[PDB]
Amino acid sequence: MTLGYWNIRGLAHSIRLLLEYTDSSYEEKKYTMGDAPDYDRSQWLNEKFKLGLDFPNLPYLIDGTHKITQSNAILRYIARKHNLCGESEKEQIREDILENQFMDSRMQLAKLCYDPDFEKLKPEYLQALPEMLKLYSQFLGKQPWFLGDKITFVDFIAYDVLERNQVFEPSCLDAFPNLKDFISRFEGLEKISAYMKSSRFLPRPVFTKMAVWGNK
Ligand X SMILES: CC/C(=C/SC[C@H](NC(=O)CC[C@H](N)C(=O)O)C(=O)NCC(=O)O)C(=O)c1ccc(OCC(=O)NCCCCNC(=O)COc2ccc(C(=O)/C(=C/SC[C@H](NC(=O)CC[C@H](N)C(=O)O)C(=O)NCC(=O)O)CC)c(Cl)c2Cl)c(Cl)c1Cl
Residue 121 region, left (φ>0) first, then alpha (ψ -120 to 50), else beta? alpha
Please check if 42 is assigned to a binding site.
yes
Please check if 29 is assigned to a binding site.
no
- Residue selected from 57, 121, 181, 203 as contacting ligand X according to rule CB under 6 A: 57
The minimum distance between CB 122 and ligand X, in angstroms, equals 17
- Residue selected from 30, 48, 180, 185 as contacting ligand X according to rule CB under 6 A: 48
- Residue selected from 27, 37, 50, 55 as contacting a copy of itself according to rule CB under 8 A: 55
Please check if 200 is assigned to a binding site.
no
13 forms part of the interface with ligand X (CB under 6 A): no
Please check if 57 is assigned to a binding site.
yes
Please check if 198 is assigned to a binding site.
no
Identify residues 81-110 at the interface with ligand X (CB under 6 A): 100, 103-104, 106-107, 110
Count the Cβ atoms, other than its own, within 10 Å of residue 9: 22
Please check if 114 is assigned to a binding site.
yes
Alpha-carbon distance 78 to 59, whole Å? 14
H helices of the chain, where? 13-21, 42-45, 71-81, 89-113, 118-140, 153-168, 177-188, 190-196
Q: Which does 55 bind (CB under 5 to 8 A by kind): ligand X, a copy of itself, none?
A: a copy of itself
- 67 pairs with which residues across the strands? 62
Identify residues 103-142 at the interface with a copy of itself (CB under 8 A): 135, 138-139
Alpha-carbon distance 167 to 75, whole Å? 23
Rg (CA), the chain: 17
User: What phi and psi, each to the nearest 5 degrees, are found at residue 98?
Assistant: -70, -35
Count the Cβ atoms, other than its own, within 10 Å of residue 210: 12
Give the interface with ligand X as residue ranges (CB under 6 A): 6, 10-11, 48, 57-59, 70-72, 100, 103-104, 106-107, 110, 207-208
Give the interface with a copy of itself as residue ranges (CB under 8 A): 54-55, 66, 68-73, 76-77, 80, 89-90, 92-93, 96-97, 99-101, 135, 138-139
